[PDB]
Structures are given as C-alpha cells and as structure tokens.
Design a protein around this ligand. Structure first.
Ligand SMILES: [Mg+2]
Length: 276
DNA sequence: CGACGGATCC
DNA sequence: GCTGATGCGC
DNA sequence: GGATCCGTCGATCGCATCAGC
C-alpha cells in the first residue's frame, strides 16, 4: 500500500507555534545528490538546520553550490580519514552553534565521519550515520559494540540540555517500520540484535521516537527503499531515519514528517518542527 | 533485500 | 581528461 | 490447496581505482 504523509502540524499540542525546523537526509552521495537536484528540494523546505548522512565526499570536493546557501551559512562536515568515498556526515545551520564536536569520543584518533554534535541555546543536536551490519551480517557484532558505545556517549553528555538525535540509525525498530518484516529478520537493519539495541537506546538515554509518538499505529511509513526492483514505486520500504527526542522536548513537538516525494537518494528526507 | 521456488501447515 | 570496467560497501 | 515459512539468488546505486588512449 502507498503512503501519504499527513499535512504539516506547525503548532504544539498546547497551541504554541513552531520556531525551529530541522531536516535530516541520507543523500547517498553528496555530489550525486546535488546533480539530482537535492539542493533545490532543500531550498523549498527551507529548514533552520540541515543534517546530511552518507556524503561520500571530502572537504575539498564539496560542490560550490553548498557554500552558497545563505540561510544555512554555518556548516560542519566530517569524513573518515581511511575510507574516503564512504560514510561522511554534515550539519548546516542558520544560526551558529555554541559548540561543535565530532565522533563519539576518540574521533581525533579514530576519524570515522559518522557523528556530529552541535550545542545550541536550548538543546543539543546529534546527527548520526549508524554503521551498517553488512550483507550477510558480517559486521553485526561490530554494530552491536558501536550501538553500546553510542548509547553510553549519548547518556553521558556533559550538558544538561535536552537532546535531539537525528539521522540514519540504520534499523527498523518494529515490524510496522518495514514492508517485509518476516522476510528480513536475518537481514541487516532488522535483526533482533539491532532492534534490541534501538530499544536500549530509547530506554538508556532516554529518548522518544518523535514520529511514532505522534503516529503510533500508522503503517507503510518508510524513509528508505532499495534502488533495485522498483521498490520505491511499490513503497516496499523501511523506516531507518528518525528524530529521537528527550522526554522534556515532547511538549515542544509539533510534527515529525516523512518527505516521501523528495527524490535524489534511496532515502527521503525527514523533517522536525519544534516549538522552542 | 526483494523476488522466487520449494517445503510445511491444517 | 575522459570513458567504461571492476571492486566494494551498502 | 491457500497461506505461510524459509533459504537462495541476482538485483541498482555512488564512488575509488585502474586500463586504455
Ligand atoms: Mg545507503
């Protein structure tokens, strides 16, 4: 069955207007995504903050078009030192953050280019490209060890401000989060191990899944479709991209969107509206 | 990772 | 410099 | 004997490198 995201709710449950719009997008190659007009879509979306995953692009190769975003002028990029053309994340912001950091602790010695932390006035934003378990699960144990390290890193954040975590967390939490749950229970992204790590992330930090909090029983809402077999045209997909929020931020939550129609990648964008 | 073929379930 | 093949990861 | 379960197979993409010219 196809899916149509509901209209943008730009007002908090108590009636407060949204003041902050965050967009997150696994672009599956920054240079290719720009050629497929991804940046034209970002301009129409006009977010205050834009988070990108899988940029696959070093610091010298970023297209000029990107610097020329005047409403997103503060930009922070990280790529892995070893595997250029792999991973890579970015964070673009209207206002300048108070602090930006990279990685989950040892980045200066282990530059993986998967995590950016940006502290703002009233909240901390983490965007993440979570490592894949791999075809045939060959890196699943590494993913479980990474999940645990990431969990610990997020819990032990010095700042007492609430947390927004977004990006490609590379797991469909529950059966409602993908089209073919039973056929995928031993595939990367829906193993019991990755699902349990997601549940432990929510409990340990603690965090709430913004989209599922608002739409707890809505099926067929996905953010990824394999390029192959025309999966996107049949909406055979997985929800892999999330906005996870501190409990204190839930009254500020206006809406959590899935931008199903925006092309340019095998993921589509997600967008958060907060009344801060 | 979806499609597909083959086995098992009542 | 440019194309297309191959390898790799996802 | 329709529905479900489960293991196998080949499918798209972006980017790096390499061969060739
Ligand atoms: Mg990907």
């Amino acid at each position: 069955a196809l899916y149509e995201d509901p209209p943008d709710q730009k007002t908090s449950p108590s009636g407060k207007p949204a003041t902050l719009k965050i967009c997150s997008w696994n672009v599956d190659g920054l240079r290719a995504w720009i050629k497929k007009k991804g940046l034209d879509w970002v301009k129409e979306e006009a977010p205050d903050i834009l988070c990108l995953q899988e940029t696959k692009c070093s610091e010298n190769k970023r297209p000029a078009e990107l610097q020329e975003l005047p409403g997103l002028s503060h930009q922070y990029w990280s790529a892995p030192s070893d595997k250029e053309g792999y991973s890579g994340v970015g964070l673009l912001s209207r206002q300048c953050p108070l602090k930006v950091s990279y990685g989950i602790g040892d980045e200066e010695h282990d530059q993986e280019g998967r995590v950016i932390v940006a502290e703002f006035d009233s909240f901390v934003l983490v965007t993440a490209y979570v490592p894949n378990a791999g075809r045939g699960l060959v890196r699943l144990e590494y993913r479980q060890r990474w999940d645990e390290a990431f969990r610990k890193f997020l819990k032990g954040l010095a700042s007492r401000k609430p947390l927004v975590l977004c990006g490609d967390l590379n797991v469909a939490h529950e059966e409602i989060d993908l089209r073919n749950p039973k056929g995928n229970k031993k595939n990367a992204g829906f193993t019991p191990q990755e699902r349990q790590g997601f549940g432990e992330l929510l409990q340990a930090v603690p965090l709430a899944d913004s989209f599922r909090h608002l739409y707890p029983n809505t099926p067929y809402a996905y953010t990824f479709w394999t390029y192959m077999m025309n999966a996107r045209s049949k909406n055979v997909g997985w929800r892999l991209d999330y906005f996870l929020l501190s409990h204190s931020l839930l009254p500020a939550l206006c809406d959590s969107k899935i931008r199903s129609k925006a092309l340019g990648s095998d993921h589509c964008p997600i967008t958060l509206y907060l009344a801060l």
